[PDB]
Nucleic acid binder design. Structure first.
Length: 287
DNA sequence: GCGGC
DNA sequence: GCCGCAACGCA
């Protein structure tokens, strides 16, 4: 029986805009339906600002022993330790998220799948690819959206559909559902090849190695977040920046608008009221 | 934000 | 009151 009590409702987590815990709480109730599909079955990494975006935050992955018993969870082994993650898959789970002041929710591109037998959750294959397009110092949007279309076209050549999401920060994330789910290892190799093929077509506009030295006036097409041990901001997640911006799904037509900007939480709310989930095809097989 | 100390 | 609360890929 899922219950969550909001405390400090009027406490401001975004000093610049007066955005409160209750605002955040309402936002996540507002997006639950369209957001859940994309984080369902996935280990939820939280980044938390209990005292607002002008105060120290922390990453949290392990689930606290005192977190509500009804939260679904699963365990991931990694290079030097085990970790039990929460899995958010209900509106109440996003209520907890908001009460926790977990402004940001991050997930990998794979989901847990049950063991043949009786339900032990283990990491499954990548169900989608993500690309992170990071604009170097002084990089035009004409450069950013041109690169995003180029990635789209490459992926289309191999039968894949691509959905753009402004990261709410500086980035631009592109997601592709896989009709043939593959290992995170394979997905990474595939993504790397795409990033690299693109680099070769427009070396002055695109780079595929992260090294900050080759990162000025160029778009860095980051392919590495398809690694199974990496994580990416969830679609619809708030960002812990001075403004309550969101990893907002966009249309390709919107990318054609030179007046493309990062959206705030409330703009996202009305867009949903207008168009529902642009990312509806992304996780059509979600739990 | 919240429990362990 | 104080403190922790992640751990990639190679920096």
């Amino acid at each position: 029986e899922q219950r969550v009590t909001l405390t400090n409702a009027d406490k401001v987590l975004y000093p610049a805009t007066g955005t409160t815990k209750s605002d955040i709480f309402d936002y996540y109730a507002g997006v639950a339906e369209v957001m859940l599909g994309h984080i369902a079955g996935r280990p939820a990494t939280r980044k938390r600002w209990p005292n607002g975006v002008d105060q120290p935050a922390f990453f949290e992955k392990q689930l606290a022993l005192s977190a509500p018993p009804w939260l679904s969870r699963a365990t991931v082994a990694h290079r030097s330790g085990t970790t039990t993650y929460p899995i958010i898959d209900s509106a109440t789970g996003l209520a907890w998220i908001a009460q926790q002041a977990a402004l940001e929710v991050h997930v990998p591109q794979w989901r847990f799948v049950a063991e043949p037998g009786s339900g032990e959750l283990n990491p499954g294959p990548a169900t989608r690819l993500v690309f992170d397009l990071d604009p170097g110092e002084g990089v035009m949007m004409a450069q950013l959206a041109e690169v995003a279309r180029a990635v789209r076209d490459l992926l289309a050549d191999i039968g894949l559909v691509t959905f753009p999401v402004t990261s709410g920060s500086k980035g631009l994330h592109l997601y592709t559902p896989l009709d043939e789910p593959v290992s995170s290892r394979g997905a990474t190799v595939l993504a790397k090849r795409v990033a690299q093929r693109l680099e070769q077509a427009m070396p002055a506009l695109v780079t595929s190695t992260m090294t900050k030295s080759l990162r000025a006036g160029k778009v860095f097409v980051d392919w590495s977040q398809n690694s199974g041990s990496k994580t990416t901001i969830a679609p619809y997640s708030l960002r812990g920046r001075t403004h309550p911006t969101v990893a907002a799904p966009r249309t390709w037509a919107e990318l054609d608008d030179p007046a493309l900007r990062q959206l705030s939480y409330d703009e996202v709310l009305t867009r949903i009221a207008r168009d529902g989930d642009l990312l509806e095809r992304l996780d059509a097989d979600a739990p």
